Symmetry: D2
Subunit: 283 residues, 4 copies
């Protein structure tokens, strides 16, 4: 099975698929090794790793190349975040085949207007055009197009969020990511209970961590849960602490023991494979 088939199989199978954020190939490799179903090529994580806001500031090329590098490192599906498609439906048409060719198995595109204005979401028909352009542009039918509905977040209400989801599924979306920034899952659970569409839902429970996977498994309508930014957060927490200790201790004499060893990083780098290559071809 190709990665695209694998993701499509997980969605048609009814099993709940988990995807973890990654800001580089090493972190994606660790997510694979930890057992997550797929990698989330998070725009928030990559822009955070560049110390720039997640407000379409980071170059699209930086993100597309990071997706290429991650897909060439892991064997599990990569779901790439393409923000608002980097433009209108015409840009979508030109952009999607690049993400597919980079090896992503899905893209997530949201209906926020872009760029931000000094009215928060684009018109329903305009987004329908963008999703239809994305599905028209993909080569492999198994590649997945996920439409992200921002209407709850934009404060437009549940009726409108469901109306948009249905319009997007009618335009070709393979799944609907309904988002919420509330600190409790009530708004999301009410949307789920009311969702009437045939395609599966996608949740990013970052703001409402109390909704566990067992709680999500109980929602037959959800096929994917995404851990949106826990790798960059974990990284920051530990780097900041090790740096503060090194400066307080005046050195690495204390901190060294606790850290993963240099040998462990060399193994994560594929040293083994490289030695086989040197042994069989360096002459």
């Amino acid at each position: 099975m190709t990665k695209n088939q694998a993701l499509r199989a997980a969605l048609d199978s009814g099993r709940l698929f988990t995807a973890m954020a990654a800001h580089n190939p090493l972190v994606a490799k660790l997510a694979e090794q930890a057992g997550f179903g797929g990698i989330w090529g998070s725009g928030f994580e990559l822009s955070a790793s560049y110390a720039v806001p997640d407000a379409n500031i980071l170059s699209m090329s930086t993100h597309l190349e990071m997706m290429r590098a991650i897909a060439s490192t892991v064997s599990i599906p990569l779901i790439a975040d393409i923000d608002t498609g980097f433009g209108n439906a015409v840009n979508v048409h030109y952009v999607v085949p690049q993400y597919e060719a980079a090896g992503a198995s899905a893209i997530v595109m949201e209906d926020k207007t872009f760029p931000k204005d000094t009215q928060e979401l684009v018109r329903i028909e305009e987004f329908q055009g963008k999703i239809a352009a994305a599905t028209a542009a993909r080569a492999d039918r198994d590649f997945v197009v996920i439409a992200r509905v921002e209407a709850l977040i934009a404060g437009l209400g549940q009726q409108e969020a469901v109306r948009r989801g249905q319009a997007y599924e009618e335009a070709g979306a393979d799944a609907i990511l309904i988002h919420s920034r509330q600190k409790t899952p009530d708004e999301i659970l009410a949307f789920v209970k009311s969702w009437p569409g045939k395609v599966p839902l996608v949740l990013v429970p970052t703001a409402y961590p109390q909704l566990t996977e067992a709680d999500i498994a109980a929602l037959s309508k959800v096929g994917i849960v995404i851990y949106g930014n826990h790798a960059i957060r974990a990284a920051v927490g530990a780097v900041r602490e090790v740096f503060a200790r090194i400066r307080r201790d005046g050195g690495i004499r204390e901190v060294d023991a606790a850290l993963p060893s240099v040998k462990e990083i060399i193994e994560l780098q594929g040293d083994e494979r490289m030695r086989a290559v040197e042994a069989r071809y360096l002459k």
Copy 2:
């Protein structure tokens, strides 16, 4: 003071300068905030973050662009690792002005032969040519060229390591990074005691962590200590643990509390500055 002046001032001042590894701008920003003197644009860390060996596999462009991005984020000097110069003295000549223009305040270039052969170091005169090409190519005289001597590691002995260091300083090196993979500092300390050159030494005590900064401060001949790969190691240690917990707990309900908050990452991303910009220019 420009960053190049700042680094040159630290070297001429006699104070011991500390530089910490960083594999992205966010980590470089944390090193700055923790109080390190400069950033080490480590080839080992960047290749590890790509999950490829540190054996000249990673594209030079990937590293040069990462240096640009780090220098545009921090206010402290960036010392860039240029491995063996990506080629001979002619490549050095073309490559150095790019690293300088990217905003690096120094480059470290080692005398290993390249590419690796199926004799371990290049000829002394050939490396002298490479260092002279680097110093000839730089525009700002304050930009620093550091020659890294691999002779101890290559097992060529102390006499040869010192002979090479002196030849490189005679060719124009502003400092000599003497390296060692021993688990105790004896080999390095004996080299230091014997070093007769006028330029300062640089140590990367990764393999012999028991040599503390107070121990290094006692070596008047050393002007720089570099923490070679502690950021990627710290990152791996924490990402791996958070991923394993999320998979064991079936969710983020437990791990969320401990992590730095999303709001903390947004602040590290420069959200404040961005709000001032939106407030004064988005109309």
Copy 3:
């Protein structure tokens, strides 16, 4: 004089400054050698060279890196085309310092809305915000910000085109590029005669080639003329003809004599400089 000073000197001097399109560093080098005042880092030319439409499809990174490469090759000022700023005023703020750091001496930003809609220009105050963000973001005050007014092209009339130009100059534009796609210069000349602002105008006479430099010199209000796309056009014309001849002749036996020699390209590549470098540093 730095390049930014040189461009500012040409603008304050009253002399008419000429800038020629270039789609790569070699073509920019030829423009310099032909005697043009500066290079026009045309988005139309670079997208045409990629065989994609000039409709914000080409990655911004591809263009920014091409500007870097051109500025590192020529000694004359580079005026970079940044389309609509790749976003709103916030993107402008983040984008301008990158073009400045790449070595461009000016940017040209137009008031078209972006992305294109299924109302043609952005609101006057919104563009004023974008220009003010650009001038706020530049480090060197000599770097030039040129506002391009699309109102004639958008069919909004002369009064509105002048109103926009004046608003942009009031927001900080150092010059106003008034554009026209008419096949005669009447619309442009009438705008010029009516222009009341203090800053100089910029013309791109591509569509009305009969307006010569002597005709433009007679317009004291114009300080810059840009040849918008003549390099890619010339290139296409000759490549297409040589390819057709090679296929008709079944070889290069006939076409070879007419072509510039391989030795001539090697000289344009800086072979001389490289031999001096090899001679003095390859040891």
Copy 4:
């Protein structure tokens, strides 16, 4: 048929395959349209277009990304120039899958030592290792690995050039590119007459243009002829002339008529396709 199959079919078919140099996707598109069999992703042409010597100065990433862009534009096979493999057999192993994934249908790798020394070619067994690494690294067996023999050029004689070719074919090369800088084809024709290997030869007759395709068709042992640098040469010849005319005429009033029209470039950019996309998806 995929492009790799198409190239393999041309090689097994006995027909003579023609490939033309291209320094960008537009020029590659013109070569396709002129009727050449494939595109030659020339390192000389791309470095010349950057105004840097063809001496491994140009970044490998710049070339790899240009190959991606060319392959995404044309429908015919792309033969990519990978110089000496950017390193030893280990680099070859890591580099080949990237060129394959970029969409190249073949790579050409030469046996020159690298980097150049202050002995001209690598050891036969070392190159055999590099070619075996390339064939081991490719995913699709149809992808073609071409070994370029520099022994004639290095002045090592015909016996050694043939010995190297045979060793490389024994290591897995699908074809042997025998090169010569002589101004007459005698050296090349004598090598051809003596060539005993089973795989086809590749010629780059740039220096001896009098060897026509009809002359090459008569050499049953040659399966590919490459026009090495005629696109950049044609481009330079015409750009230089148009620039000189514009400066002599003080404008474009005279030169405009002769040039391909702006409308012609817009068509080469895929405007048609883009209008269909806008018409069916921009809503």
